[PDB]
Amino acid sequence: EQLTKCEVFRELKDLKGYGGVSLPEWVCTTFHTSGYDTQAIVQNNDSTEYGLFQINNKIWCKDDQNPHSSNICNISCDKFLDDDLTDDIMCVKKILDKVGINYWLAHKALCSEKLDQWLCE
Amino acid sequence: EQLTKCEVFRELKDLKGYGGVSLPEWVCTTFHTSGYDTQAIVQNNDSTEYGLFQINNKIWCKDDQNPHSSNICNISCDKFLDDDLTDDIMCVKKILDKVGINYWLAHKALCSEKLDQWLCEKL
Amino acid sequence: EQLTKCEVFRELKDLKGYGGVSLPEWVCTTFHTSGYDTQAIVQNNDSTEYGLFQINNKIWCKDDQNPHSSNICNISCDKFLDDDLTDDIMCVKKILDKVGINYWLAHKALCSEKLDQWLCE
Amino acid sequence: EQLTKCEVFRELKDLKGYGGVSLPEWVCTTFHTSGYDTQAIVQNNDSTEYGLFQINNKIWCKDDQNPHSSNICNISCDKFLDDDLTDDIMCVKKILDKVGINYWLAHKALCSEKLDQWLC
Amino acid sequence: EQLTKCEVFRELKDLKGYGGVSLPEWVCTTFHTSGYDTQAIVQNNDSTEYGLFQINNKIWCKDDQNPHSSNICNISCDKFLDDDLTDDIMCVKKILDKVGINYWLAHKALCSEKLDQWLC
Amino acid sequence: EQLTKCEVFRELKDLKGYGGVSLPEWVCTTFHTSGYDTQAIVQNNDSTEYGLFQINNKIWCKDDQNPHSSNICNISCDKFLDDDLTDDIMCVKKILDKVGINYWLAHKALCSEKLDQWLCEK
């Protein structure tokens, strides 16, 4: 499912304030990460990244590709491909606890200025 | 070279049933893999993926990046970027024989059901 | 920041002939590389690619992800996400000098021949 | 810092029985891992493995090489090169919890049976 | 097991002349690859190399670490840590077939001359 | 060639003080990286490391394995496998120039102090 900026904004309300990051920072980050596509999937030779936040199967979730993954989010990666972002949000909180919002390079690279444009009326 | 659901459907007829996988499954998988673009190419720091099936150059084919690739499909990777999908299919059959359809994670994740929407009637 | 074939053609003028490569080849390559988007950023498990030319943080530039980067172009990777392609071109000349145009597989695979459609007149 | 087959038994006591793995298995596994050298360090192009258990800087601990490591064990990797194996063991227990003893391929491979030679 | 140069020269007799490479070249190559240790194993974040020839689990054999390995040699990697080098040899031929002796960089760099010192 | 501490100490004189690192530090680091084996070669899936200093074919030199290496030292990797440490040092200087001594993780943790055992009163 390809969401609209305002839709992402709404759906991510649960992440508001987590780790102190605001929604415009989240909307901007996910835009540069998956272009707002909940079904985004990229398979490389060693790993595959899943969904809206492009979570990878080497550390966060379990795959057919990496069954020996640390699976920090204790979930099967494909659960990140459907339309209910509940699972994504749960795992993302785990990532923020372990590495921080800057785990995503796009946050600092493209989301530290002109933040008002990522806002929703 | 961008294709549509039914052109992919028509051109992958030879994979139909091969190894026990159905056509809608393939149409679905290639969609989530390359969005039906025969010239899709993704270069990473140490591996690059080619064509409609995004075949990588570490194992299946050879290119200047990984000259020591196992090159199981015995072909130069750029043959996967033309519009003739014959070379591609030969290789895919080799991948299926060795690893199976779920070698493509998108298949297991998004193309193992509800395939009805990947259908093209009259073939 | 999505350019058009001809804007790219215009902006990369300083690369013309460099390393013996013609502009139509440059236009073709960046099209297959970033789709002409000066802000393309692809983050993988341990490397991230930046901008029009998708320059990576393991060798050419400095990231928060790879601080021990050889950083051949002596620059922080995010300078490749702005609209000013000056940084990018300076770095691309470096890459050309060190490895060559075929460092980009898209060039060899698709942009060394049948260049007519990449012409901009 | 080189331990002998017997010191290892002593030092890894806290691991005994944890995750179902016995000491002789650990003695065997760590032998194939680091030769009982607690300062063992293998640096590759992208990853680096530290200490007796050869814990990597990509997932388990934080490095200068990999500052964005998920750092699951919440610790700086060089604390695995000291002679206090307390922090090592604590991290190993997390790996066991999250992945299991077979995360170490040498275990399943060479330290599954004939565990007699690994006694002290 | 830790073979000697002579023990290796004997057990790799089957590779004699395959793909055109001589026994000394093979002895030299394995020397620089594993020091003749048939139980040599090196696990990294993404792959693991096994045995005398340090065969990796991403392409040649089936692992717990890499179950989607193309498994070209249709064999589980642990079989490369046995003292019986028959499997190792079967797989090495496949590698010579798909890639060539120079798949091992040590061969081209160190085992292409001054070979008489690898004779037995 | 398997050298002794002092043979290595001797051969790396040009590196004395380069980038601020003393010989005792180098003699310690190279022992931890290659065991003083000038012919050490470690081949992995994606890269290989060569010689005394274990320089890789991903960034510093050119290989048949990685022909598209950035090849910063502008040298073919196997030149790092012989007895003459001259190219090795030339390249180590470039690495020190680009990334620094702590490019070698063993240095920081094991070869920064308590170096009595690594001196040579030659």
From Swiss-Prot, chains A, C:
Biological function: Regulatory subunit of lactose synthase, changes the substrate specificity of galactosyltransferase in the mammary gland making glucose a good acceptor substrate for this enzyme. This enables LS to synthesize lactose, the major carbohydrate component of milk. In other tissues, galactosyltransferase transfers galactose onto the N-acetylglucosamine of the oligosaccharide chains in glycoproteins.
Keyword Oxidoreductase applies: no
Tissue specificity remark: Mammary gland specific. Secreted in milk.
Carbohydrate attachment residues: 45
Organism: Bos taurus (Bovine)
Family: Belongs to the glycosyl hydrolase 22 family.
Top-rank lineage group of the source organism: Eukaryota
PANTHER family tied to this protein: ALPHA-LACTALBUMIN (PTHR11407:SF32), LYSOZYME C (PTHR11407)
Family matches, as Pfam families: Lys
Gene from which this protein is expressed: LALBA
Protein name per UniProt: Alpha-lactalbumin
